[PDB]
Amino acid sequence: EDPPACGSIVPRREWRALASECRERLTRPVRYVVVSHTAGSHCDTPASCAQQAQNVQSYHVRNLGWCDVGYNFLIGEDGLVYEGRGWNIKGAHAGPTWNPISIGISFMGNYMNRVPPPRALRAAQNLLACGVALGALRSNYEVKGHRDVQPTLSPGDRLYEIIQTWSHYRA
Amino acid sequence: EDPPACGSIVPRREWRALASECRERLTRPVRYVVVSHTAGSHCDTPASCAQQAQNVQSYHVRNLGWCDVGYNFLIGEDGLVYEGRGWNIKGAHAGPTWNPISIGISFMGNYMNRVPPPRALRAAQNLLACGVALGALRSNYEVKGHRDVQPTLSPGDRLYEIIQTWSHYRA
Numbered sequence: 001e002d003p004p005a006c007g008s009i010v011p012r013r014e015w016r017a018l019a020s021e022c023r024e025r026l027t028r029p030v031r032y033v034v035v036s037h038t039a040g041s042h043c044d045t046p047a048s049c050a051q052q053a054q055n056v057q058s059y060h061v062r063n064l065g066w067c068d069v070g071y072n073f074l075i076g077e078d079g080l081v082y083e084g085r086g087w088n089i090k091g092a093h094a095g096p097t098w099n100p101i102s103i104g105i106s107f108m109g110n111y112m113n114r115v116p117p118p119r120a121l122r123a124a125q126n127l128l129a130c131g132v133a134l135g136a137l138r139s140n141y142e143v144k145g146h147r148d149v150q151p152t153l154s155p156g157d158r159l160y161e162i163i164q165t166w167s168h169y170r171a
Numbered sequence: 172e173d174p175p176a177c178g179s180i181v182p183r184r185e186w187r188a189l190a191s192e193c194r195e196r197l198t199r200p201v202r203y204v205v206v207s208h209t210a211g212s213h214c215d216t217p218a219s220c221a222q223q224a225q226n227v228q229s230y231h232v233r234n235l236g237w238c239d240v241g242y243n244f245l246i247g248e249d250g251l252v253y254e255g256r257g258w259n260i261k262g263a264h265a266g267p268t269w270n271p272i273s274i275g276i277s278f279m280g281n282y283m284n285r286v287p288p289p290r291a292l293r294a295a296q297n298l299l300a301c302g303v304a305l306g307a308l309r310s311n312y313e314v315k316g317h318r319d320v321q322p323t324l325s326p327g328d329r330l331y332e333i334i335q336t337w338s339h340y341r342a
């Protein structure tokens with residue numbers, strides 16, 4: 001229901017997601033974007049990646065007791081973006097400092113010794129673009145690695161060096 | 172014009188397409204979008220869909236002797252948009268009356284007794300928005316079924332019924 005909709009995103013319902021219980025909202029236009037990797041399994045198909053979105057969310061909700069999967073968005077290697085908390089709800093990916101002043105997107109998989117296909121990178125940037133068009137993101141926006149803000153290897157050596165060559169990337 | 176690049180499209184190089192020998196351009200902004208199906212085998216993974224787009228292009232160039240894949244864009248059930256002749260080049264999808272004044276989008280598969288998945292419909296729709304934003308399509312552009320402009324079943328009863336419900340569909 002109620003879809004138009006931008007950057008070709010797989011809606012929560014499409015991926016058979018449990019419902020959110022999160023309330024805290026993000027004050028848009030948002031300034032930062034933090035890229036992480038789930039550090040979980042990778043997947044390269046609509047089917048496999050939906051099952052992985054579930055797996056990630058399930059771990060976050062049933063096990064860490066969170067109100068919803070931690071990320072605002074998840075990127076699959078199938079080149080599709082999966083809906084997490086979204087543009088409006090504050091995420092849980094970067095620590096109390098960074099969670100309310102940024103959107104966090106996560107690439108499903110471990111990218112330490114592996115690199116994400118061009119399509120996933122496309123879906124990523126394309127995702128950010130839609131964000132500006134929406135007022136959710138800030139056109140002047142800045143990109144940061146998960147590791148650029150938290151003692152963590154995330155989003156992986158391989159992927160980390162790519163987002164640095166991104167134009168909107170700041171260190 | 173309107174600089175920022177739009178949406179996620181799998182480029183030619185990526186699905187391994189033969190080089191295009193087409194030269195006749197379209198006059199921007201285009202007023203019509205004609206939707207068809209390939210009535211060929213469907214595909215639901217980036218991997219399998221790239222092959223299929225190739226099979227379709229192949230069949231058009233090698234067997235029908237066209238300058239390129241007939242469609243301007245192809246949609247896969249993997250939820251991805253496959254680049255063909257693209258926005259600026261007259262295609263070969265709908266006859267001499269319609270090929271000079273329209274964009275042809277084809278859904279890979281036969282949608283007579285199957286509907287395409289939401290991710291497919293979503294990609295197709297997001298693409299059209301991309302066209303508008305770019306100025307390749309009129310903001311008031313009109314979507315037509317292939318059967319509405321030529322005598323064919325394509326784009327399939329199921330998919331035809333769906334596009335009828337689109338904001339820009341005019342029989």
Ligand SMILES: CCCCCCCCCCCCCCCC(=O)O
Binds near residue numbers: 004005176177178300
């Ligand atoms: C290049 C970046 C993406 C731009 C693509 C065009 C954006 C138009 C599509 C916006 C979605 C239409 C509905 C409005 C949003 C909503 O209802 O939530």
